[PDB]
């Protein structure tokens, strides 16, 4: 699916935050918040060069 791994509202926390600069899920109150996103090395993210 062309939308796989992209239906996520996430943003990077910036440099110098003692964590990796991968975009992270916002919001709160759930285990999803703060997890990495959008990257091919991230669980639940988008694969590298998706098949067409």
CB of 23 to RNA, least distance (A): 10
- The reply to whether 21 sits near RNA by the rule CB under 7 A is yes
C-alpha to C-alpha distance for 52 and 36, rounded to whole angstroms: 25
Which residue carries 């998706």 as its tokens?
50
CB of 21 to RNA, least distance (A): 5
CB of 7 to RNA, least distance (A): 5
- The reply to whether 11 sits near RNA by the rule CB under 7 A is no
- CA-CA-CA-CA dihedral for 1, 45, 8, 37, to nearest 10: -160
DSSP 27: S
What is the binding site for RNA (CB under 7 A)? 1-10, 15-22, 25-36, 39, 41-45, 47, 49, 51
């Amino acid at each position: 699916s062309e939308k796989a791994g992209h239906q996520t509202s996430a943003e990077s926390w910036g440099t110098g935050r003692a964590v990796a600069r991968i975009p992270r899920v916002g919001g709160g109150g759930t285990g999803r918040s703060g997890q990495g996103a959008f990257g091919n090395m991230c669980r639940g993210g988008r694969m590298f060069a998706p098949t067409k």
